[PDB]
Paper text:
HIF, closely linked to disorders of the circulatory system and cancer progression, consists of two multidomain subunits including the constitutively expressed HIF-1β and an oxygen-labile HIF-1α (or paralogs HIF-2α and -3α). HIF-3α9, the longest (669 aa) and canonical isoform3, is a potent oxygen-labile transcription factor, tightly regulating the expression of a unique set of genes. Due to the use of different transcription initiation sites and a combination of splicing events in HIF3A, the C-terminal Per-Arnt-Sim sensor domain (PASb) is the only common architectural feature among the HIF-3α isoforms. The PASb domains in both HIF-α and -β subunits have a crucial role in forming active HIF heterodimers and recruiting co-regulators.
As such, the aliphatic tail of the fatty acid extended to eighteen carbons in length (maximum length limited by the cavity size), with a cis double bond between C11 and C12, interspersed by four gauche configurations (at positions C5, C7, C9 and C13,). The sn-2 position is not substituted, also sharing a hydrogen bond with the Leu340 main chain amino group. However, the presence of a well-coordinate sulfate ion (abundant in the crystallization solution), 6 Å apart from the glycerol sn-3 hydroxyl, suggested that PASb-3α could also bind to phospholipids.
Author numbering: 238 to 342
């Protein structure tokens, strides 16, 4: 029920995470807020996710390939993300990011 969303600052720190993160990955949203999403991407997928983020910032929207997200248990979930920038109202420095996520496995 409802798309699985997150919000981030430009450094990819979570500012919001869907509550269902507990059901899916063990975290509560409180565990992730203020933490950079880069820390939760499997090292094998980090470069590809960065390239997607570069496209996101250039074009304004991007879709990742499948990638591995670090669950609280230490295992990884295969995920995929569509994202957009969102103007902050104060100029370029105020931009933020909104994501919708999909579980691949
Ligand atoms: C380009 C920016 C790319 C930024 C990528 C990095 C940002 C955040 C890391 C991922 C956080 C969410 C993980 C759990 C996702 C669960 C999704 C979920 O449960 O989806 C159900 C759906 O498949 C319908 O069944």
């Amino acid at each position: 029920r409802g798309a699985f969303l997150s919000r981030h600052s430009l450094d990819m720190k979570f500012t919001y995470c869907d509550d269902r993160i507990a059901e899916v990955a063990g975290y509560s949203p409180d565990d992730l807020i203020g933490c950079s999403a880069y820390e939760y991407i499997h090292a094998l997928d980090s470069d590809a996710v960065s390239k997607s983020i570069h496209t996101l910032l250039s074009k304004g929207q991007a879709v990742t390939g499948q990638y591995r997200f670090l669950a609280r248990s230490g295992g990884y979930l295969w995920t995929q993300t569509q994202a957009t920038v969102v103007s902050g109202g104060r100029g370029p420095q105020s931009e933020s990011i909104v994501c919708v996520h999909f579980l691949i496995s």
